[PDB]
Design a protein around this nucleic acid. Structure first.
Ligand SMILES: Nc1ncnc2c1ncn2[C@@H]1O[C@H](COP(=O)(O)OP(=O)(O)O)[C@@H](O)[C@H]1O
Lengths: 1144, 99
DNA sequence: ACCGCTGCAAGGAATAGGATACTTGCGGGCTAATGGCGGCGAATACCC
């Protein structure tokens, strides 16, 4: 037995109450399952609608749809995106007769009127094979549409009907179709010829949807022009809407000139309701309809101006509120509401008590106390309602801590007397149904506290005798503490005006005689001195603003790059790359695992990848393209080819999150091949790191993903064969080639979105390959983009346009010090938005709370820094508002334009500008570039805009962007090949292993050969070879005097270099392996077979514990105030001189 | 002197007020004669005579439209802001233009 | 009576916090015109 009867009458209301969160969804699931007929739920707003749109399907099985509302604002200047229109009418086609099903419409839509049904039942046809309809019925429907019976159809406006077979040749298409009606049913959809009468295609459901919701042809145009000349006045203007439509073309908001395209009164969509339909209500209409109508009118006379595009009165484009509440007496209606109505007929309150305080915290010792004390005393069944599948396991071990067993059921009716079940769905809040003692508990019913912590306020607890108890007899010159600032000298009471309010204040003098006048009212912040040093008291300076401390004077060039870059490049160009092997059918079975079809450009990109992989050369390919164009599966097909040749694929990304999606992608795609794939980041524990990286040497993990943790000078791949690097424009140069330093002829493949200028230029100059991609598989949107001045009502209407769509807004400010103020600055600007705060510098738990609550639509607008640039999901976010687009890099401008979108919904993007002459010229060039290119495939040419405004950086150094007056590329190539044949001239050991076999001698001191001393980088390179390959002090001194011979004196960087090499000699002579030094001291780490006198080292420790501590067996931390680096050198020199005098 | 309104109280109240001698600008000083010594050179600002802000009625004396028609016009000229003009069409109209 | 079980002491272990040093971007501070006439295209509006 159910609980309540239903409204089945012309205009009866059914009041239902006691309703907490998400109970209404399973109630209307009950409604649909108990009523043979449609259920249309009226929503109070888009958000709840969309929220309820996945709620209801959680609880039942019937087909559930929204009506696609026009996405725009009332009287906006935007088309409603025809595709949506194509969805809109389609539902509206079947809306007259739809027997079972649930439609959610909002009051925004339900107050809107629709097409007069003449156009729809005439100038459109969707028809599916399971439609039991006869022959003469469709014959007279074609007759009522106005079509002609020709039995050999060739013309628009024709149909045939002979025997059982019916044919049609429409307004829409150039083809006739054969119907073949049988047993009062449709039984063929045969695309037959215009003349030859044989079928092209067997269809089940024919979809001839009109290109618009409104008539578009000529007779419609003169009818429209008749209406416009009747209503408005036509002015001579080549942009006025009358002439614009008279030319046949269309403006953006043209649909809001609805009724002139019919010359009939427009139905309020009530005409489209079925015979006995059941309307169910949520919240109330009696509130939201009023303020929507008020907004509607206020917007109408807000734009009841501007003879360029005048508007119709809203009485035609909408119902009035009273008109609604009249037509709401035409249907049996249900009103669900969140309180207890007392008692009457057509009214019931059903036990839906809100859940008790069930919450988790790490502060209590056993976190699940409320649940562990609730579940044994809850007599009824318990349901767990996890949203996600993997999050199910997040509950799986979690209730295993309280040892409580979830069973996976599908139906809420599956509850027993007392049993614990998990439900996969989309709920947000739980409840107890005390009718059957059922309990539903959402995941979000666990983490109720999104709370911060307070601080400071120390002297407010200091209520001691020094507070003077507000004596008010204090003398002048008394040193007085004021707890926010410090101590001043009290200098009397003074009257001051304060903006129409005179007042009396206590003038107090701080340092630099800055006065401070606290009111006499709040006298309790003021305390007498406690130190007893009234004539020796200090003075605080007020404000404590020590920003001045940002002046100047930091040096650089502690380590040269150019020689080492030339070295690794020469080493690459010397050895030969690996010729990979390709298997047709083995690669084809991997292609079979791809559940999609390659776009042809994607295929030839993949083909160019493989037909470069399998070569004796070394791969170096840019696979540049726009985001979301299918880059990853190219790397999939590359890696598979690589991994079957047993080559230990290494994956690099510059964040933890991208590694996290990549782990899923790699593992899910490689679901059938004997390959072990793992990841590493800071999120992995050390005990997992210490086995993963060790096992990398062993090598059964073949695919390894990670952040910079790979490039940490400890990871040793046993046979590296493939480097794949993602999201390029990071990584400097050193991190980019630090991996290639391990293996000279490794193959490198670099994915990107918009390449940095340096790697763009080096690719376009023939040094690296380039393979551009375009043409995304799904028809994505070029999310219209604007660059406008800052304007309080422009941002307001943008926010409103997004929120009455129903999604969320990324509003980015990118300054954390004032984002709190900017939050309320936006918040009273748009009082009906819900604003939370998120940035990268929070306590790393509230951030995740904010992003997950964002992910569960608990609020609308997020104020943020560029943390969102890490590329999170949630495509419901559909509008970026960059408040100060003056100071933002153009590549990540494109990246942030990629953040919105991800949907069939038309995303938007407003780029607020300051005043144009205020900004930098370079900013203007950037903004003109981004305003020029709004397409797909335009990411790359936008990187060609990134280059050639900043200068592609130096080809043989760091600093990827910059003019810099670099090494010329022709000279670059010459120096490169000179290094090449000088390198292969006599098999010269790579410099990188001369790094490795060298003892760690780091001293945080600039040690290099400067460019003025040696311009030729080959010569400096071979000198580096000769110094690090020198094994006698005699040869070091000979090299040194040869340097002096060649170039005059010896500068300090050269001298320091040479004596560090001297130190390396005795370091490797004794076994002193790891030596770090700094200003403060440093660490001497010996070998396990070391030449340390142990008793004498203990003697060092016990004569100066302040300057010798063994922290570890061979780790000697020495603490020395090594202010002068010369003293540092001589300290370490004489120290190892002591140690060799004690060497054993 | 900075005033801070305390947020908890209603609109217009005083949390605290501070004050200090801020320095801004180095204005030149006239000497005892008339000279401003700017960069070791010795400049003098001359008094400018300009058309006084107010409202003036004028007419181009039949130099336009050749009918012998004089075209009266009115100007409201602020000391700071936007101008305002009325004038006459030869067809005996009044026409306003701004800036 | 004596293991069997529990509650507390400890000790190590793991993890937040707050340092440091590295990358991208880019700007901010900072040294290093409303006193005129004429021609012509645009842009008319204007009568046909
Ligand atoms: N050839 C294709 N056919 C259909 N869908 C594709 C195709 N290639 C890619 N896609 C879709 O596009 C997405 C590919 O994005 P991916 O390469 O993983 O990273 P990015 O988003 O950076 O391109 C996948 O979700 C996939 O469903």
């Amino acid at each position: 037995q159910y609980r309540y009867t239903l409204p089945v009458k012309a205009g009866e209301q059914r009041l239902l109450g006691e309703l907490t969160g998400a109970a209404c969804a399973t109630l209307v699931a009950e409604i649909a399952e108990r009523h043979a007929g449609p259920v249309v739920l009226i929503a109070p707003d888009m958000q709840n609608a969309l929220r309820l749109h996945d709620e209801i399907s959680q609880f039942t099985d019937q087909m559930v749809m929204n009506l696609a509302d026009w996405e725009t604002l009332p009287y906006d200047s935007f088309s409603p995106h025809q595709d949506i229109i194509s969805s809109r009418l389609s539902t509206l086609y079947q809306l007259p007769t739809m027997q079972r099903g649930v439609l959610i419409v909002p009051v925004n839509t339900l107050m809107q009127r629709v097409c007069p049904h003449s156009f729809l039942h005439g100038h459109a046809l969707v028809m599916k094979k399971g439609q039991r309809l006869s022959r003469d019925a469709l014959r007279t429907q074609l007759d009522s549409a106005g079509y002609r019976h020709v039995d050999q159809v060739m013309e628009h406006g024709e149909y045939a009907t002979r025997g059982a077979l019916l044919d049609l040749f429409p307004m829409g298409s150039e083809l006739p179709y054969r119907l073949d009606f049988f047993d009062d049913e449709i039984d063929s959809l045969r695309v037959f010829d215009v003349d030859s009468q044989r079928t092209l295609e067997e269809v089940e459901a024919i979809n001839l949807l009109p290109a618009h919701e409104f008539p578009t042809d000529k007779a419609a145009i003169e009818l429209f022009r008749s209406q416009w000349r009747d209503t408005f006045e036509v002015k001579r203007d080549p942009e006025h809407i009358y002439q614009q439509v008279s030319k046949g073309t269309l403006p953006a908001g043209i649909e809001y000139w609805q009724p002139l395209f019919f010359s009939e009164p427009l139905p309020p969509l009530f005409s489209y309701f079925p015979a006995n339909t059941l309307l169910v209500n949520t919240g109330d209409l009696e509130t939201s309809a009023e303020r929507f109508q008020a907004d509607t009118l206020a917007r109408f006379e807000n734009r009841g101006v501007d003879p360029m595009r005048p508007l119709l009165p809203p009485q035609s484009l909408w119902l009035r509120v009273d008109e609604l509440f009249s037509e709401l007496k035409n249907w049996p209606r249900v009103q669900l509401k969140t309180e207890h109505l007392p008692t009457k007929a057509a009214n019931a309150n059903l036990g839906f008590q809100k859940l008790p305080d069930l919450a988790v915290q790490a502060q209590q010792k056993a976190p699940l106390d409320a649940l562990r004390k609730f579940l044994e005393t809850f007599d009824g069944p318990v349901v767990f309602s996890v949203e996600s599948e993997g999050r199910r396991e997040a509950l799986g071990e979690l209730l295993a801590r309280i040892k409580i067993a979830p069973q996976r059921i599908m139906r809420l009716d599956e509850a027993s007397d007392r049993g614990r079940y998990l439900m996969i769905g989309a709920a947000e809040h739980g409840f107890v149904d005390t009718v059957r003692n059922l309990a539903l508990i959402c995941e979000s019913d666990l983490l109720g506290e999104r709370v911060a912590r307070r601080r400071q306020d120390s002297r407010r607890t200091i209520n001691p005798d020094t507070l003077i108890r507000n004596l008010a007899e204090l003398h002048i010159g008394q040193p007085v503490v004021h707890l926010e600032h410090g101590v001043g000298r009290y200098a009397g009471m003074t009257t001051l005006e304060a903006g129409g309010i005179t007042g009396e204040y206590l003038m107090l003098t701080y340092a630099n005689d800055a006065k401070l006048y606290v009111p006499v009212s709040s006298l309790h912040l003021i305390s007498r001195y406690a130190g007893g040093a009234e004539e020796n008291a200090p003075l605080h300076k007020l404000g404590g603003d020590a920003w001045s401390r940002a002046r100047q004077k930091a040096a650089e060039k502690v380590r040269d790059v150019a020689a080492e870059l030339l070295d690794i490049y020469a080493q690459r160009a010397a050895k030969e790359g690996f010729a990979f092997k390709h298997d047709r059918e083995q690669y084809q079975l991997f292609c079979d695992s791809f559940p999609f079809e390659t776009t042809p450009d994607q295929a030839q990109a993949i083909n160019a990848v493989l037909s470069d992989m399998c070569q004796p050369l070394a791969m170096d390919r840019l696979v540049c393209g726009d985001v979301g164009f299918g880059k990853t599966e190219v790397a999939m097909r590359a890696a598979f080819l690589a991994v079957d040749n047993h080559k230990q694929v290494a994956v690099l990304v510059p964040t933890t999150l991208l590694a996290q999606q990549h782990y899923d992608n790699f593992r899910d795609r490689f679901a059938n091949w004997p390959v072990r794939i793992e990841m590493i980041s800071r999120f992995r524990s050390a005990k997992e790191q210490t086995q993963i990286l060790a096992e990398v040497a062993e090598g059964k993990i073949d695919i390894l993903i990670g952040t910079h943790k790979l490039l940490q000078s400890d990871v040793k791949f046993k046979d590296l064969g493939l480097l794949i690097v993602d999201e390029e424009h990071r990584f400097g140069v050193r991190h980019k080639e630090r991996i290639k330093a391990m293996r000279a002829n490794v193959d490198i493949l670099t994915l990107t979105a918009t390449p940095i200028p340096r790697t763009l230029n080096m690719a376009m100059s023939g040094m690296r390959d380039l393979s551009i991609i375009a043409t995304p598989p799904a028809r994505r949107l070029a999310v219209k983009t604007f660059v406008r001045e800052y304007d309080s009502m422009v941002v307001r209407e943008a926010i409103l346009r997004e929120i009455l769509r129903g999604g969320q807004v990324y509003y980015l400010y990118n300054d954390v010090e004032n984002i709190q103020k900017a939050a309320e600055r936006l918040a009273e600007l748009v009082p009906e938005a819900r604003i939370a705060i998120g940035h990268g510098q929070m306590r790393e738990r509230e951030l995740e709370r904010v992003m997950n609550d964002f992910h569960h639509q608990r609020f609308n607008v997020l104020v943020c820094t560029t943390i969102i640039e890490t590329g999170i999901d949630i495509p419901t976010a559909n509008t970026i508002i960059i408040e100060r687009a003056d100071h933002f890099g153009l590549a990540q401008l494109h990246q942030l334009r990629g953040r919105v979108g991800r949907s069939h919904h038309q995303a938007y993007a407003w780029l607020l500008t300051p005043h144009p002459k205020a900004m930098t010229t370079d900013a203007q060039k950037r903004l003109e570039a981004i305003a020029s290119l709004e397409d797909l495939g335009a990411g790359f040419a936008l990187a060609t805009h990134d280059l050639e405004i900043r200068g592609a950086g130096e080809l043989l150094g760091e600093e990827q962007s910059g003019s810099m007056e670099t090494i010329g590329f022709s000279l670059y190539m010459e120096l490169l090949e000179n290094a090449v044949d000088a390198l292969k001239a006599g098999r010269e050991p790579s410099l990188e292993d001369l790094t490795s076999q060298q003892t760690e001698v780091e001293l945080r001191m600039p040690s290099l050969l400067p460019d003025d001393f040696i311009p030729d980088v080959n010569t400096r390179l071979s000198f580096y070879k000769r110094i690090a390959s020198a094994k006698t002090e005699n040869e070091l001194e000979e090299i040194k005097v040869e340097l002096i011979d060649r170039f005059g004196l010896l500068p300090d960087p050269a001298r320091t270099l040479l004596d560090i090499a001297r130190l390396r000699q005795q370091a490797q002579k004794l076994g002193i392996r790891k030596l770090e030094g700094n200003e403060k001291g440093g660490v001497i780490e010996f070998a396990e077979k070391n030449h340390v006198n142990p008793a004498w080292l203990i003697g060092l420790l016990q004569k100066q514990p302040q300057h010798y501590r063994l922290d570890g067996p061979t780790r000697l931390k020495f603490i020395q105030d090594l202010s002068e680096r010369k003293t540092r050198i001589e300290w370490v020199r004489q120290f190892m001189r002591e140690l060799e005098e004690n060497a054993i | 002197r900075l005033v801070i309104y305390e947020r908890e109280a209603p609109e217009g109240t005083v949390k605290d007020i501070k004050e200090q001698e801020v320095y801004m600008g180095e204005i030149p000083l006239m000497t005892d004669n008339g000279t401003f010594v700017i960069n070791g050179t010795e400049r003098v600002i001359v008094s400018q005579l300009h058309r006084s802000p107010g409202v003036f009625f004028d007419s181009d004396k039949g130099k336009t439209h050749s009918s012998g028609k004089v075209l009266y016009n009115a100007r409201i000229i602020p000391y700071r802001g936007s101008w305002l003009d009325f004038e006459f069409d030869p067809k005996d109209n009044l026409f306003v233009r701004i800036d």
